[PDB]
Paper text:
A common feature of virtually all reported PD-1/PD-L1 SMI is that they target PD-L1 through a biphenyl-based scaffold originally developed by Bristol Myers Squibb (BMS).19−21 However, none of these molecules has progressed into clinical trials so far. The HTRF assay was also validated on the BMS-1166 compound, yielding IC50 of 3.89 nM as compared to 1.40 nM reported in the literature. The 1,4-benzodioxane group creates the standard interaction with ATyr56 (the monomer molecules are annotated by subscripts A and B according to their chain arrangement in the crystal structure of the dimer), previously observed by us for the BMS-202, BMS-1001, and BMS-1166 compounds.
The PD-1/PD-L1 axis is responsible for inhibiting excessive stimulation and normally aims at maintaining immune tolerance to self-antigens by negatively regulating the immune response. By blocking the PD-1/PD-L1 interaction, activation of T cells can be achieved for an improved antitumor response. Therefore, the immune checkpoint blockade (ICB) of PD-1 or PD-L1 at the tumor cell–T cell interface has become an attractive strategy for cancer immunotherapy. Although the PD-1/PD-L1 interface is considered difficult to treat with SMIs due to its large, flat surface of interaction with no visible binding pockets, the number of patents and publications on anti-PD-L1 SMIs is constantly growing.
Residue numbers in the entry:
A (entry chain A): 18 to 143
B (entry chain B): 18 to 142
């Protein structure tokens, strides 16, 4: 069966830092981009949509616009890697990677965000 | 772009009753069963896994054994219908139909379960 695997299902990230979260998928001889679909979301909010060679970048939910991207070079290695920069408290939660490549699967990754009082206070109130 | 559609977003069902929840996907002329994958889940629990034209029996979550099935006849018409019998309070929540058919998409369906006090009390513990 087509299986997606996750080397780390838990990530601890410091507020303001950047993170790369990964989902692995099997690629046999060489990757066929045209047959690949990669989708990332966090709590029903679209983050990455890569379809048959192209990403619909602008559909990324507003909270992530200009903040997250898929490392395209990694796909040829069978690694769907999502990089999010300038991590916020709001970024904490359960991420899902949905992959279709001659079969389909998805996995969950949990992200925890540590933050100092100043950031926490802002998040708390605003 | 491949799109899955749900005519009905919300289902309100009575405890002990039956429900059929539907997700629609486009089938051009004749269904190519080999390319189709239909997956149904609620809160990460596997309900249905239709791959290769066949349901995966041992993969369904225990809470749904004998109560849930995909109506195979409907697939050819581009309808993935999940039929659940003997609805429980535990069945209330957000369902997801994930479909791969020469493209991929998913949709969410919300189910609310009405129940009498006795059933509710048992659920409450
Ligand atoms: C993801 C996807 C599916 C997933 O369909 C399956 C999921 C499966 O599990 C999901 C699962 C099960 C249990 C735990 C987790 C976690 N945490 C995840 C299995 C059970 N699986 C059998 C294998 O052994 C793996 C195994 C498992 O890992 O448990 C089999 C199938 Cl067919 C089906 C159809 C479409 C898409 C998809 C892909 C990309 C998309 C998209 C939809 O729409 C939007 C655009 O992009």
């Amino acid at each position: 069966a087509f299986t997606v695997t996750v080397p780390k299902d838990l990530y601890v990230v410091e507020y303001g830092s950047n993170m790369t979260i990964e989902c692995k998928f099997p690629v046999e001889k060489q990757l066929d981009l045209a047959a690949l679909i990669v989708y990332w979301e966090m709590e029903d909010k679209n983050i990455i949509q890569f379809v048959h060679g192209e990403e619909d970048l602008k559909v990324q939910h507003s909270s992530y616009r200009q903040r997250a991207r898929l490392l395209k070079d990694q796909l040829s290695l069978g690694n769907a890697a999502l990089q999010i920069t300038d991590v916020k408290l709001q970024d904490a939660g359960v991420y899902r990677c949905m992959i279709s490549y001659g079969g389909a699967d998805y996995k969950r990754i949990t992200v925890k965000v540590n933050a100092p009082y100043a950031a926490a206070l802002e998040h708390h109130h605003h």
